[PDB]
mmCIF file of C-alpha atoms and ligand atoms in Angstrom:
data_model
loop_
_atom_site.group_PDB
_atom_site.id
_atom_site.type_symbol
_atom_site.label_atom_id
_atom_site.label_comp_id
_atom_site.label_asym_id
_atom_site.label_seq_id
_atom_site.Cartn_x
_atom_site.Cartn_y
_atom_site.Cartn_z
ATOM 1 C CA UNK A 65 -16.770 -33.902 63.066
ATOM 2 C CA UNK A 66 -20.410 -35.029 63.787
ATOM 3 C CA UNK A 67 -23.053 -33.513 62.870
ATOM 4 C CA UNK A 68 -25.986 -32.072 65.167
ATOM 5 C CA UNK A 69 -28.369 -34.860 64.714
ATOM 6 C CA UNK A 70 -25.260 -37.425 65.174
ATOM 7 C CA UNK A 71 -24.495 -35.042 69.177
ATOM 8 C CA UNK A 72 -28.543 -35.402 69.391
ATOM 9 C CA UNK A 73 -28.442 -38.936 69.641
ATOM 10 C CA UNK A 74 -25.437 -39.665 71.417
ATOM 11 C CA UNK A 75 -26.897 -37.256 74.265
ATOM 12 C CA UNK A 76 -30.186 -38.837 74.023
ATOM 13 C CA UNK A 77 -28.620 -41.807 75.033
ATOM 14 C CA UNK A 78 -26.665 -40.693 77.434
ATOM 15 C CA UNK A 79 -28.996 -38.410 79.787
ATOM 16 C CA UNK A 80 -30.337 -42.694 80.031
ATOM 17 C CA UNK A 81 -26.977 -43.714 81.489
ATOM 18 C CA UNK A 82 -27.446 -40.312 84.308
ATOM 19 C CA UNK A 83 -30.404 -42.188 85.241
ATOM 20 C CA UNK A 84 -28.215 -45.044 87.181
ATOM 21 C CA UNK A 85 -24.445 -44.023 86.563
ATOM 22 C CA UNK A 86 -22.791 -46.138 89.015
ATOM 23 C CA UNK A 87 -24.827 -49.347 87.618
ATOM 24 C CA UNK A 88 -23.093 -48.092 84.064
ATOM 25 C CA UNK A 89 -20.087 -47.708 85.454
ATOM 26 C CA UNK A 90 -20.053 -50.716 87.600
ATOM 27 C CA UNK A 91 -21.066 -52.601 84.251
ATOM 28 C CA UNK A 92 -18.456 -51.240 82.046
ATOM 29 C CA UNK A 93 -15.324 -51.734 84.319
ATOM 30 C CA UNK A 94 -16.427 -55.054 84.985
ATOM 31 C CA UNK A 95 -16.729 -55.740 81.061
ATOM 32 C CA UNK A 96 -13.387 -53.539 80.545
ATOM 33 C CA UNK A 97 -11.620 -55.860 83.345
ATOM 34 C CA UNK A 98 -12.756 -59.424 81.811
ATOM 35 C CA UNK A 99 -12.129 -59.056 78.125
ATOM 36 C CA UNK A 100 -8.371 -57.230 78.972
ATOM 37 C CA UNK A 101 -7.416 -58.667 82.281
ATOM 38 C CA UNK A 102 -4.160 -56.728 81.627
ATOM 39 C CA UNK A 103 -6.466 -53.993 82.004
ATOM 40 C CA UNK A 104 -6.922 -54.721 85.899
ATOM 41 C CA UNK A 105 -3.277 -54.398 86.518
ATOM 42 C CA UNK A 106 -3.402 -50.694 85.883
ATOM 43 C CA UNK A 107 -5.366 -50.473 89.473
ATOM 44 C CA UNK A 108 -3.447 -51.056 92.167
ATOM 45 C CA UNK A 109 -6.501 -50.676 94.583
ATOM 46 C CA UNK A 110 -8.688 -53.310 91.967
ATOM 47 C CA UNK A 111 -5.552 -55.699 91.398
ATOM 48 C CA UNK A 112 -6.985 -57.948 94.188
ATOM 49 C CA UNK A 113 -10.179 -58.615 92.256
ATOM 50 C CA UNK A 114 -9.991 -62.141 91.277
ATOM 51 C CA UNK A 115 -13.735 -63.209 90.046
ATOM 52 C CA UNK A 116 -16.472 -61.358 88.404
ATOM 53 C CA UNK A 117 -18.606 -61.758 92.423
ATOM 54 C CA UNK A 118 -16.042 -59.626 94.256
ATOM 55 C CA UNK A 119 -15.986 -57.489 91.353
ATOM 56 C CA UNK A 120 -20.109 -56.791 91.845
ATOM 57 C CA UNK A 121 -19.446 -56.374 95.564
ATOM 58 C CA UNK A 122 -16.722 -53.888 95.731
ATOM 59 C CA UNK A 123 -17.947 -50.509 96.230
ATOM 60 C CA UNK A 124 -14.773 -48.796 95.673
ATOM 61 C CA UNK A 125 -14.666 -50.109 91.787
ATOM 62 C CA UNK A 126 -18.379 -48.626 92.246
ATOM 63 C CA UNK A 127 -17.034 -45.250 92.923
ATOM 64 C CA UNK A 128 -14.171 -45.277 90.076
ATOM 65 C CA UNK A 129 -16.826 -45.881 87.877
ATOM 66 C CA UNK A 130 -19.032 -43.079 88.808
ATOM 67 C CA UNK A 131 -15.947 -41.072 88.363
ATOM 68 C CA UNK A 132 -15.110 -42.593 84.525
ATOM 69 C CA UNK A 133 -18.378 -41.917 83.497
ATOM 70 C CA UNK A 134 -19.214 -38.485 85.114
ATOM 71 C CA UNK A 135 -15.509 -36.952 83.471
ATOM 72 C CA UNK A 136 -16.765 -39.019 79.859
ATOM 73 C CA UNK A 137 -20.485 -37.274 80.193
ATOM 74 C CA UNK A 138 -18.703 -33.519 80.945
ATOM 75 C CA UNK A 139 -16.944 -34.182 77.533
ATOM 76 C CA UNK A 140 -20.046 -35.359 75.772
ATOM 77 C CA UNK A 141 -21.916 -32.682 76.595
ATOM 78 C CA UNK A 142 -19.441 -30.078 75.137
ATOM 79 C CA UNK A 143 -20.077 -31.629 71.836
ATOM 80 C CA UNK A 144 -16.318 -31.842 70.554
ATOM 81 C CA UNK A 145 -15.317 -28.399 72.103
ATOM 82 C CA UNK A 146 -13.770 -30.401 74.814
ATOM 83 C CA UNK A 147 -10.385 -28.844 75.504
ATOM 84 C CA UNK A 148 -10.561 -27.617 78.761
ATOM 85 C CA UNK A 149 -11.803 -30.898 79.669
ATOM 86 C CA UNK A 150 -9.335 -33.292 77.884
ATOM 87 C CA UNK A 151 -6.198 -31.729 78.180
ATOM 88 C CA UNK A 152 -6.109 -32.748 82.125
ATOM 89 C CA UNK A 153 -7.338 -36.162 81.276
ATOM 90 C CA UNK A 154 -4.420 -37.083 78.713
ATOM 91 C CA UNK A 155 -2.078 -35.233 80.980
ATOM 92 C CA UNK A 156 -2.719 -37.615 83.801
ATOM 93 C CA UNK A 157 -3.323 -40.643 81.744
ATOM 94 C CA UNK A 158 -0.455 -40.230 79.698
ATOM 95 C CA UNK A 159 1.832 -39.211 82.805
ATOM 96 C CA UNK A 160 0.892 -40.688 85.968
ATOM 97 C CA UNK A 161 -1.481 -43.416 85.060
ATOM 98 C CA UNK A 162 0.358 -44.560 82.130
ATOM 99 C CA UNK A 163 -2.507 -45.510 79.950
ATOM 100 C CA UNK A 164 -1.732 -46.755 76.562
ATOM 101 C CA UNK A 165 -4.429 -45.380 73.722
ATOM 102 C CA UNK A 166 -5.578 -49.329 73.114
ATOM 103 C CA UNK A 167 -6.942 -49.278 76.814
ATOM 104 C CA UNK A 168 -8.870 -46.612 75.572
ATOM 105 C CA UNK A 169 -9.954 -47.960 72.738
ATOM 106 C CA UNK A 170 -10.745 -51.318 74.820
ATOM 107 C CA UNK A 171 -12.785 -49.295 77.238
ATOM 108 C CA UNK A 172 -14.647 -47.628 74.397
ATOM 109 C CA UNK A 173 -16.020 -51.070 73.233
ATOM 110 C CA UNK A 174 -17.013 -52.086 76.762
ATOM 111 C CA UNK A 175 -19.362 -48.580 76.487
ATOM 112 C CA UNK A 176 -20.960 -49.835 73.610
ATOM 113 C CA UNK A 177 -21.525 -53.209 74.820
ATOM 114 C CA UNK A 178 -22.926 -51.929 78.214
ATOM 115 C CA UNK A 179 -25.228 -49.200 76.513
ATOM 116 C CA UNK A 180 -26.954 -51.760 74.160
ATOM 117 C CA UNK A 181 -27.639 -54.528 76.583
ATOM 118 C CA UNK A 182 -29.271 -51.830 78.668
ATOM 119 C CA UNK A 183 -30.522 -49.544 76.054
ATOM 120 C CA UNK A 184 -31.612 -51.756 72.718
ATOM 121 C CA UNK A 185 -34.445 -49.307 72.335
ATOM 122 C CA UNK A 186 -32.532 -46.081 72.197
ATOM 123 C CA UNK A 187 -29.239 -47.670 71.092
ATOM 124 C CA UNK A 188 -29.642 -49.230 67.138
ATOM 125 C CA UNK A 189 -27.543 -48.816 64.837
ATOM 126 C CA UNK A 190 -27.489 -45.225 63.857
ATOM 127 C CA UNK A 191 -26.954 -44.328 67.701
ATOM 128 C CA UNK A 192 -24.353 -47.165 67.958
ATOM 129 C CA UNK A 193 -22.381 -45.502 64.987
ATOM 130 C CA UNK A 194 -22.860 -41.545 66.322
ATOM 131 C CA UNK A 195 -21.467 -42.974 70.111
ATOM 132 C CA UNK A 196 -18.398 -44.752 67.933
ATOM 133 C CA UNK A 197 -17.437 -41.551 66.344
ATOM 134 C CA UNK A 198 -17.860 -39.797 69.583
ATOM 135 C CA UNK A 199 -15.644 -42.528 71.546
ATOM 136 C CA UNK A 200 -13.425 -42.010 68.390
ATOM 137 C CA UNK A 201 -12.874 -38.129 68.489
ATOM 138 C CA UNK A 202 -12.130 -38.654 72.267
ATOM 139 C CA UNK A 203 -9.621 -41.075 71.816
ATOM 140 C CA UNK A 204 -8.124 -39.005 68.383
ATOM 141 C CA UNK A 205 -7.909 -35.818 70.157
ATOM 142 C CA UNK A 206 -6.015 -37.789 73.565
ATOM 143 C CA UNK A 207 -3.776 -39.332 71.195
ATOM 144 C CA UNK A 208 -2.618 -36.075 69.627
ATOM 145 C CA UNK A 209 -1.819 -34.851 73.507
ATOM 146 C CA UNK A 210 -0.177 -38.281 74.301
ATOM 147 C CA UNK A 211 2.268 -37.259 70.685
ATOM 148 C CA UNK A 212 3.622 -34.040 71.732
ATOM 149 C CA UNK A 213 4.109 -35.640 75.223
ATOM 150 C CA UNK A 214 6.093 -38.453 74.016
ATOM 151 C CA UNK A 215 3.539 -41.285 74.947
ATOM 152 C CA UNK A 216 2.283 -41.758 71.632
ATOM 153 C CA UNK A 217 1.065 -45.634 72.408
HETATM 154 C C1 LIG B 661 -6.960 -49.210 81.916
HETATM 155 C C2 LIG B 661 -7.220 -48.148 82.844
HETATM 156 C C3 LIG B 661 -7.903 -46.926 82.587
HETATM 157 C C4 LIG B 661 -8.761 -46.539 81.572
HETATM 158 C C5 LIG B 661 -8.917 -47.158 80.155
HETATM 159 C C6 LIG B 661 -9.252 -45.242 81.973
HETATM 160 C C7 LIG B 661 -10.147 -44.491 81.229
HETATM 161 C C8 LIG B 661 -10.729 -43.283 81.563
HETATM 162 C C9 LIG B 661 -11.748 -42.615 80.770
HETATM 163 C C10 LIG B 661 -12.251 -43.028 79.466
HETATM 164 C C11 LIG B 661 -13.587 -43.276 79.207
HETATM 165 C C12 LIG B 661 -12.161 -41.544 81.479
HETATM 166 C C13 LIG B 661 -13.195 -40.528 81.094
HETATM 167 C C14 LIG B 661 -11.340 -41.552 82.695
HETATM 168 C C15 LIG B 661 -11.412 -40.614 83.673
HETATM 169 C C16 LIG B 661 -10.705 -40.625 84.809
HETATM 170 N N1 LIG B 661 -9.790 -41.579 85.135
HETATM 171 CO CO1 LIG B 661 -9.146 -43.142 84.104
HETATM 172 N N2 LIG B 661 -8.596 -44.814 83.108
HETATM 173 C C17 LIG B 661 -7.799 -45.824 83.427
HETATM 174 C C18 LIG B 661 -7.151 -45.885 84.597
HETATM 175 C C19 LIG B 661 -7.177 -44.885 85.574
HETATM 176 C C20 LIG B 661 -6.392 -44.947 86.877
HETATM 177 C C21 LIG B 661 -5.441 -46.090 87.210
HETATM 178 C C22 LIG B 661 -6.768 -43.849 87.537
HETATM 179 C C23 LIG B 661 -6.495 -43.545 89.000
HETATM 180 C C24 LIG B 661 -7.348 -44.432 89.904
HETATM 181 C C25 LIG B 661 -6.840 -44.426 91.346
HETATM 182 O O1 LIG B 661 -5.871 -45.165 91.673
HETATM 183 O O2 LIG B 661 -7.399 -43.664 92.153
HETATM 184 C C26 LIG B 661 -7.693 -43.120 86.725
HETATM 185 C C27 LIG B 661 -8.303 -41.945 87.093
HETATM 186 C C28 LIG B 661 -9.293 -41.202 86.402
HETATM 187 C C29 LIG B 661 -9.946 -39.910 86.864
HETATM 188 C C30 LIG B 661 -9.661 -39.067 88.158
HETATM 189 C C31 LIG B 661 -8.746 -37.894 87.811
HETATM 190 C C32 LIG B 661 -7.419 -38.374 87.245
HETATM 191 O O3 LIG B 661 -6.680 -39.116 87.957
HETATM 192 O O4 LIG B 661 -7.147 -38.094 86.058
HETATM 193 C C33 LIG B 661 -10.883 -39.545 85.866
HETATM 194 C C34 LIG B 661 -11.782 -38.326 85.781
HETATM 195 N N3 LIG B 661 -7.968 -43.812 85.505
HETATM 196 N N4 LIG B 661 -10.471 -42.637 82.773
#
């Protein structure tokens, strides 16, 4: 559980990243898609992205990223009483996208990366470890979907 002045910063932070969501998101998949290639293969639409350029110039990785990151800030914003919100997520991640929990995990360290190259002053340490327990909650309270629906992993 984090505590009010942990949600304060992470929020802080993150009404930043509605300034310019696709450029976040845009950022972060492209991070996401060069440290776990294996990653890209999940896309069938971004499978044909072969170098970090066409990557930049496709608009339609553009748009899933305004879509990652406008479902991740709904879920912020309800400060851990995300049910309503997650439950759909896991089901189609778990289901039809067939996302292991590691992507998740992977995707979560792309976040940080992205928010402290663009945020240093609003993202040291303290605001670094209140987004990690965030990304962390997220991912814990997935998993426990993706166990009673027999995707655990
Ligand atoms: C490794 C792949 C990967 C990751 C880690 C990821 C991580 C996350 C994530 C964590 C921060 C959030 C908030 C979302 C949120 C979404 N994802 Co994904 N998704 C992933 C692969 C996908 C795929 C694949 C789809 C469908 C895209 C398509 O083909 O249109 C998807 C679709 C979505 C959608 C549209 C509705 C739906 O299909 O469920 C939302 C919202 N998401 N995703």
């Amino acid at each position: 559980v984090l505590s009010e002045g942990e949600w304060q910063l992470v929020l802080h932070v993150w009404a930043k990243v509605e300034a310019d969501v696709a450029g976040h998101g845009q950022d972060i998949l492209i991070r996401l898609f060069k440290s776990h290639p294996e990653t890209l293969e999940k896309f069938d639409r971004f499978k044909h992205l072969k170098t970090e350029a066409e990557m930049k110039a496709s608009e339609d990785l553009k748009k899933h990223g305004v879509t990652v990151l406008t479902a991740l800030g709904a879920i912020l914003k309800k400060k851990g009483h995300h049910e309503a919100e997650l439950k759909p997520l896991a089901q189609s991640h778990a289901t039809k996208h067939k996302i292991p929990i590691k992507y998740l995990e992977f995707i979560s360290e792309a976040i940080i990366h992205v928010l402290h190259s663009r945020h240093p002053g609003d993202f040291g340490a303290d605001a670094q470890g209140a987004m990690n327990k965030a990304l962390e909650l997220f991912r814990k309270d997935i998993a426990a979907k993706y166990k009673e629906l027999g995707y655990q992993g």
